[PDB]
Amino acid sequence: TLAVYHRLWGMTEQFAARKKWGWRQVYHRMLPFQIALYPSLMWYLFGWFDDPYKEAMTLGIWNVSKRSLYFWDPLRSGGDKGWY
Amino acid sequence: SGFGTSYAHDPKWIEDWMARKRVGVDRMDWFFRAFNRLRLYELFFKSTPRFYAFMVIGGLLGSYYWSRFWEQYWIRVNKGRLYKDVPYVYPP
Ligand SMILES: CCCCCCCCCCCCCCCCCC(=O)OC[C@H](COP(=O)([O-])OCC(O)COP(=O)([O-])OC[C@@H](COC(=O)CCCCCCCCCCCCCCCCC)OC(=O)CCCCCCCCCCCCCCCCC)OC(=O)CCCCCCCCCCCCCCCCC
Ligand SMILES: CCCCCCCCCCCCCCCCCC(=O)OC[C@H](COP(=O)([O-])OCC(O)COP(=O)([O-])OC[C@@H](COC(=O)CCCCCCCCCCCCCCCCC)OC(=O)CCCCCCCCCCCCCCCCC)OC(=O)CCCCCCCCCCCCCCCCC
Ligand SMILES: CCCCCCCCCCCCCCCCCC(=O)OC[C@H](COP(=O)([O-])OCC[N+](C)(C)C)OC(=O)CCCCCCCCCCCCCCCCC
Ligand SMILES: CCCCCCCCCCCCCCCCCC(=O)OC[C@H](COP(=O)([O-])OCC[N+](C)(C)C)OC(=O)CCCCCCCCCCCCCCCCC
Ligand SMILES: CCCCCCCC/C=C/CCCCCCCC(=O)OC[C@H](COP(=O)(O)OCCN)OC(=O)CCCCCCC/C=C/CCCCCCCC
């Protein structure tokens, strides 16, 4: 019967490894939230980057020609040197 | 009839209106049937993290092209009256 007790004692020997695995599975389930976090950050920080990085970050969809007709810096509407 | 008195009661045509229950009739089922084929629910809505990503990425793209569309509308309506449309001629 001591053998049985040995098995019952030993079935929890690896508690630290099992609790680590538990938390590793909670973190695995939280990785998908990155899909929304990262684009939201770049969405809020877009105005911080320089124009050439704005263009590259959007694969060229955004460029200087895409700035609004009334740019917040009116002297730079239509380009850095103005419309004409 | 009886409008404006304590005898007011629903006219006949309102009673007939409320007698039409449209039981067992669905004239808009085609819309939902075709909408479901986009698989938006299976791909995005069902999972909360993907639901958030749809709102964020959709808002990002939607906001940009919404601005783009109405900027073109503004340029068309005000054609010939914008600063860019009328290059200035310097006096000699
Ligand atoms: C991001 C993209 C993702 C991928 C692509 C996605 C593509 C899909 C996009 C889909 C977009 C939505 C389209 C509409 C879907 C159908 C309607 C719906 O929601 O169904 C749910 C549900 C369906 O009804 P149900 O009773 O459950 O149906 C049961 C059975 O299916 C059938 O039951 P039944 O057969 O027994 O019928 C019962 C019921 C069935 O219910 C209905 O069918 C009635 C409700 C239909 C609403 C339709 C909404 C359309 C959306 C507007 C789009 C605007 C485009 C503008 C373009 C501008 C571009 C810049 O009908 C009635 O109760 C009978 C009376 C109905 C009276 C309705 C009066 C509407 C008059 C419209 C006149 C328009 C004239 C325009 C002239 C313009 C000239 C230039 O309807 C609603 O809940 C909708 C009405 C809610 C109140 C409306 C709020 C009004 C205030 C806002 C005003 C501003 C509008 C802004 C529009 C924004 C658009 C984005
Ligand atoms: C009798 C009456 C009849 C009435 C008929 C009415 C017809 C209905 C009309 C509606 C349309 C019908 C279409 C029929 C298609 C038939 C063919 C077929 O079998 O379809 C395949 C299939 C149909 O599903 P199924 O065959 O029944 O399979 C069911 C499965 O559960 C689902 O399959 P699955 O998920 O296993 O595989 C789908 C797979 C198909 O694709 C693949 O398998 C490709 C996999 C990659 C292969 C390797 C490629 C390597 C190279 C890549 C190079 C390119 C890189 C760059 C790509 C950039 C892309 C942006 O991926 C996708 O389609 C997209 C999902 C990708 C993964 C999503 C999860 C990732 C995280 C997302 C985070 C959440 C937010 C995201 C952002 C949301 C937006 C803000 O998929 C679709 O048709 C669904 C399309 C999903 C895309 C979004 C659609 C929404 C946008 C609609 C716009 C509408 C505009 C309206 C304009 C109106 C003008 C007036
Ligand atoms: C199998 C598929 C592979 C997919 C990826 C590769 C193929 C993709 C499709 C083709 C495009 C290839 C890439 C081209 C990009 C060009 C961008 C460019 O030059 O833009 C111009 C801009 C501005 O350059 P410019 O100012 O000289 O002007 C460009 C010139 N004109 C104007 C004429 C267009 O440059 C950039 O923005 C350069 C960005 C480089 C970014 C490199 C990132 C590398 C990865 C970093 C990892 C960081 C995390 C580390 C983690 C550590 C571990 C935890
Ligand atoms: C393991 C192998 C993986 C690869 C497998 C093969 C398939 C994929 C291979 C792709 C390689 C080819 C990429 C071509 C890039 C051309 C860039 C260019 O000329 O930009 C000039 C543009 C414009 O240059 P500009 O700023 O000088 O503009 C001049 C404008 N005019 C003419 C009016 C004066 O530059 C940029 O926008 C800079 C950023 C570049 C964009 C980001 C990197 C490239 C992304 C490629 C995406 C490909 C997907 C399909 C297209 C998506 C868009 C609709
Ligand atoms: C759960 C708590 C959450 C708390 C969240 C707090 C609120 C966060 C608000 C997010 C704001 C995002 C940034 C907005 C920037 C706007 C950019 C813009 O419009 O640009 C204005 C204008 C544009 O000028 P241009 O001539 O085009 O040249 C600039 C360079 N290309 O100037 C700029 O872009 C400058 C922008 C500078 C941004 C600096 C960003 C880095 C700041 C670091 C913050 C670190 C915070 C750490 C907090 C730790 C707390 C424990």
The A residues from 1 to 20 touching B (CB cutoff 8 Å) are none
Q: H helices then E strands: how many in chain B? A: 4, 0
Instruction: Report the C-alpha gap between A78 and A64 in whole angstroms.
Output: 8
Per the CB < 8 Å rule, is B60 touching A69? no
State the burial class of residue B18 (Cβ atoms within 10 Å of its Cβ: 0-12, 13-18, 19+): exposed
Q: Which residue has the tokens 């209106």?
A: B17
- Experimentally, the structure was elucidated by cryo-EM
Instruction: Report the C-alpha gap between B90 and B10 in whole angstroms.
Output: 75
Residue of chain B whose Cα is closest to the Cα of A84: B87
Four-point Cα dihedral B67, B72, B74, B75, nearest 10: 140
User: What is the stated resolution of the deposited model, in angstroms?
Assistant: 2.2
Four-point Cα dihedral A36, A37, A39, A43, nearest 10: 120
Instruction: Report the C-alpha gap between A82 and A76 in whole angstroms.
Output: 5
Give the mutation target among B17, B21, B25, B28 for probing the ligand 1 site: most ligand atoms within 8 A of CB: B28
Question: Interhelix angle for A34-44 vs B48-77, to 10°?
Answer: 30
A72 touches chain B (CB under 8 A): no
Q: What's the gap in Å between A49 CA and the centre of ligand 3?
A: 15
CB pairs under 8 A between A and B: 38
Is the Cα torsion angle A21, A22, A23, A26 positive or negative in sign?
Answer: positive
B81 touches chain A (CB under 8 A): no
